[PDB]
């Protein structure tokens, strides 16, 4: 049964070694040409593994590991693939010695739990009450992005956004509740928090639309205003909405029929009922959470108890933007959320700006689950191997040899960082271990910092990945 595992390890090692060249900003970029003729270029490990269309069944698990890497930690999608292949490469000599993969798999889970406590003792203890390190963490992370001078004002906006939803014991917080709406026009210097909610579209541009209303109710309605005499059919639709005093109508976007008839615009103009159409399907679940409302399919299902409250609903005047904002949801059951509007002249600005804020919110969220940060650049990978050197002598049996090979696989990550930078691989690693007798974590003066959750999740996900790889002893066709 070893021929099935050895074939999967070698096939997965070639994938990990291929992504290994993409580690770091100076790493080698990989090209993938789709059958349709599209060619993409980037160093992202999650994008390469997704568009590669790997036919190997076990190698497809790296996509799920890279997906959870960006969803939990938010960084290290390339490093988790390298660490996964490092354990697979070290497991090749383990099988040659006659070791069953169960001991190999059970030792990685025990070594991953002990590696967390080693990093926590060497990590710097920080708290969320201090905003000095929270602003500098997100500001230096944007040095790899187009934003440079405007990144100074973007850091405190992301800090105050997380501190409201972080609380204390909440631990993990869903990132889908943070919506970044990009729109052409404006600039980066203009930002509005708008903690109530922010939509993705504009308002009615036709004649008669108020486009602004004060003290209105907001609710989700899946109905649509359409003809089947036609004004009498549309009058009963607007009359039932007036019964619950709902001045804000949100209609789900559908290409089947229209949203609101022009005849109904004159009816709602006298009642001062604002209408916002073209609501995307992705925002249906979003608006049902922060606003605390419920999707309403029919007109009979529409009730007053499912309607929220809005202080002032207005359409902000801006060049090529016209963004509508809502403040003061006034809902005790529904917790508030953060929706930030992104503006810029070029389309390439608001695009990368949204992705740049994603990595900034993840690193800050890493401090919410587990506080503290570890300086990157190969420091946590080498520090663990330094502690496991003397600990390997305290073990007994087959596992004693695994601790030595586990620390050897951790050296692959700092070695790749030296290779992609043009410096000598071994020479740089020896200089770091030479000064380890004096310095410990010292990169601190270079304003380069990394959260502890990235280094913790990379070891945990890679330990379970390789554990599940050795569990497949056969490949069968079942349809």
């Amino acid at each position: 049964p070893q021929e099935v595992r050895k074939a999967n390890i070698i096939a997965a090692r070639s994938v990990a070694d291929a992504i290994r060249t993409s580690l770091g900003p100076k790493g080698m970029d990989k090209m993938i040409k789709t059958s349709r003729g599209e060619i993409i270029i980037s160093n992202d490990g999650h994008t390469i593994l997704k568009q590669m269309a790997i036919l190997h069944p076990v190698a497809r698990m790296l996509v799920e590991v890279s997906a959870a890497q960006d969803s939990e930690a938010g960084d290290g999608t390339t490093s988790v693939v390298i660490l996964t292949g490092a354990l697979l490469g070290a497991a090749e000599r383990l099988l040659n010695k006659g070791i069953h993969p169960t001991i190999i798999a059970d030792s990685f889970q025990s070594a991953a739990k002990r590696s967390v406590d080693i990093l926590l003792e060497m990590c710097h203890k920080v708290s969320l009450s201090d905003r000095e390190q929270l602003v500098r963490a997100a500001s230096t992370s944007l040095s790899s992005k187009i934003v440079s001078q405007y990144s100074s004002f973007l850091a405190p906006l992301a800090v105050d956004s997380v501190l409201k939803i972080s609380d204390e014991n909440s631990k993990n917080v869903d990132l889908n509740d943070i919506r970044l709406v990009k729109k052409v026009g404006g600039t980066i210097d203009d930002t509005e928090m708008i903690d109530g909610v922010v939509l993705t579209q504009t308002a009615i541009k036709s004649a008669g639309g108020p486009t602004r209303k004060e003290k209105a109710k907001i609710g989700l309605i899946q109905f649509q205003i359409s003809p089947p005499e036609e004004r009498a059919y549309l009058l009963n639709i607007c009359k039932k909405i007036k019964k619950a005093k709902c001045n804000v109508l949100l209609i789900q976007k559908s290409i089947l029929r229209d949203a609101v008839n022009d005849l109904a615009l004159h009816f709602l103009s006298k009642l001062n009922i604002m209408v916002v159409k073209d609501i995307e399907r992705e925002e249906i679940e979003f608006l049902s959470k922060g606003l605390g409302c419920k999707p309403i399919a029919d007109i009979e299902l529409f009730t007053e108890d499912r309607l929220g409250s809005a202080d002032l609903v207005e359409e902000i005047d801006s060049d090529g933007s016209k963004i509508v904002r809502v403040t003061g949801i006034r809902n005790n059951n529904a917790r508030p959320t953060v929706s930030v509007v992104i503006r810029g002249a070029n389309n390439m600005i608001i695009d990368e700006t949204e992705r740049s804020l994603h990595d900034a919110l993840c690193v800050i969220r890493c401090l919410v689950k587990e506080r503290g940060l570890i300086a990157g650049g190969g420091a946590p990978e080498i520090e663990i191997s330094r502690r496991l050197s003397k600990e390997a002598r305290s073990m007994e049996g087959v596992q004693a040899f695994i601790w030595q090979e586990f620390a050897s696989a951790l050296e692959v990550i700092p070695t790749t960082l030296a290779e992609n930078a043009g410096l000598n691989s071994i020479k740089v690693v020896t200089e770091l271990r030479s000064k380890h007798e004096n310095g410990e974590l010292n990169t601190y003066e270079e304003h380069i910092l990394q959260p502890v959750l990235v280094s913790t999740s990379a070891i945990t996900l890679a330990s379970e990945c390789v554990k599940s790889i050795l569990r497949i002893d056969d490949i069968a066709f079942s349809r």
Partner: protein
């Protein structure tokens, strides 16, 4: 198919070299022109190197 290592690196250099060697004759006002034939069989005669690269059909990511 997947090709890595120095084998694909040499093919990328020879591919750009083949494309470069075609346009080296049109460099400068004293240079020589060329004819670009399509699948229909027609062609054109021009000394401008900017219009040549636009009408030249080459399948290659670096091309």
């Amino acid at each position: 198919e997947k090709i890595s290592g120095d084998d694909i690196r040499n093919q990328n250099v020879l591919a750009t070299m083949a494309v470069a060697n075609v346009v080296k004759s049109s460099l400068g006002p004293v240079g020589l022109d060329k004819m670009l034939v399509d699948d229909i069989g027609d062609f054109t005669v021009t000394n401008d190197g900017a219009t040549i690269l636009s009408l030249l059909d080459v399948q290659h990511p670096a091309g």
